[PDB]
Amino acid sequence: ISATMVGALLGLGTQMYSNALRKLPYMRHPWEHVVGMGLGAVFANQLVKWDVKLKEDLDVMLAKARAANERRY
Amino acid sequence: QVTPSPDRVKWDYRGQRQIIPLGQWLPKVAVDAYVAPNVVLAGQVTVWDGSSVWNGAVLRGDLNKITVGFCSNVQERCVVHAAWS
Numbered sequence: 001i002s003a004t005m006v007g008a009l010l011g012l013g014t015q016m017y018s019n020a021l022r023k024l025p026y027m028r029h030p031w032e033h034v035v036g037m038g039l040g041a042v043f044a045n046q047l048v049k050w051d052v053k054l055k056e057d058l059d060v061m062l063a064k065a066r067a068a069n070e071r072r073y
Numbered sequence: 074q075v076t077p078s079p080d081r082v083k084w085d086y087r088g089q090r091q092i093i094p095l096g097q098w099l100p101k102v103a104v105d106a107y108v109a110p111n112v113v114l115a116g117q118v119t120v121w122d123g124s125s126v127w128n129g130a131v132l133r134g135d136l137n138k139i140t141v142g143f144c145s146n147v148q149e150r151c152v153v154h155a156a157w158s
């Protein structure tokens with residue numbers, strides 16, 4: 001589990017999911033399977049980075065809101 | 074009276090043309106349905122999903138439409154035809 005094996009596995013899985021959902025054999029086009037693996041890995045890594053950034057820029061804003069509330073007295 | 078012509082071909086190079094469209098009528102074979110290379114689909118046959126048509130079958134519906142249902146097989150050397158009435 002390194003945010004990339006899960007991404008690659010999920011991309012390959014959704015590639016076979018799309019391929020077999022049209023009633024086709026699962027491994028029709030291997031090239032789109034490998035590009036799906038790549039896209040899944042990239043999207044998973046970027047999702048992890050975006051989550052970290054979202055938390056980082058949410059804490060610094062929640063602190064500002066709490067400080068603004070604390071100046072009531 | 075019978076006479077030869079040079080338009081005749083003693084070796085049809087291309088093959089058999091398994092799918093024979095008749096004007097606008099086209100054999101509607103669905104994906105995941107096995108149709109052997111020897112099978113001849115002509116006229117307006119429709120093969121549905123999960124079906125299978127085996128080699129030697131001469132499915133042709135040039136007179137009336139012929140249909141094969143889901144997961145239904147037409148075995149080898151089976152000639153299927155249709156009539157006007």
Ligand SMILES: CCCCCCCCCCC(CCCCCCCCCC)(CO[C@H]1O[C@@H](CO)[C@H](O[C@@H]2O[C@@H](CO)[C@H](O)[C@@H](O)[C@@H]2O)[C@@H](O)[C@@H]1O)CO[C@H]1O[C@@H](CO)[C@H](O[C@@H]2O[C@@H](CO)[C@H](O)[C@@H](O)[C@@H]2O)[C@@H](O)[C@H]1O
Pocket residue numbers: 001002003006007010011039040041043044047048049051052055056
């Ligand atoms: C949908 C199916 C879900 C099935 C799996 C579910 C299980 C998910 C866990 C798997 C997983 C990937 C998530 C995959 C998402 C799938 C994307 C779907 C679309 C794909 C097509 C999340 O696992 C960790 O991710 C962290 C991300 O924040 C979070 O930790 C919290 O974060 C804090 C935030 O502020 C919190 O404050 C705090 O409490 C926690 O620390 C938690 O989510 C969790 O601990 C694996 O961890 C991955 O995340 C990080 C940290 O390891 C790694 O990157 C790091 O980057 C640098 C610093 O970022 C580091 O310097 C660097 O060293 C490292 O490289 C990755 O390499 C990998 O390790």
